[PDB]
Ligand SMILES: COc1ncccc1CC(=O)N1CCC[C@@H](C(N)=O)C1
């Protein structure tokens with residue numbers, strides 16, 4: 001689990017979005033595993049606006065943060081789950097590291113701010129859904 005709170009928005013993994021998230025829907029993209037809902041309180045997370053390929057992510061299954069090198073956002077093939085059939089997930093970044101399903105939502109950060117959230121894993125690779133291109137989260 002995990003979310004990003006920025007301005008009057010809440011960014012979550014689309015597959016973990018709640019009834020409240022869907023009742024206050026702003027934008028969702030199944031191909032990215034992202035959903036943004038509106039909030040009443042003001043969030044103060046800072047979104048990174050950069051091309052960093054190194055950062056640190058929170059891994060709840062180890063209660064630890066790990067430093068990683070990660071690929072630029074791209075279309076990557078992802079195996080089926082109870083939420084999606086096998087498909088290409090877009091805007092995804094991979095790194096070598098540990099993850100388990102419950103780790104989705106963990107934040108990846110660089111020196112500039114939030115980069116994305118854990119969204120996929122398997123075979124010793126962890127994938128992060130990028131949010132740096134969503135310039136509207138700040139306005
Ligand atoms: C962090 O996730 C994992 N890590 C290790 C093993 C397995 C996982 C689960 C995984 O990959 N998922 C979770 C359900 C949604 C799927 C998607 N985005 O298409 C991805």
Ligand SMILES: [Zn+2]
Pocket residue numbers: 048049050051052110111112113
């Ligand atoms: Zn950065």
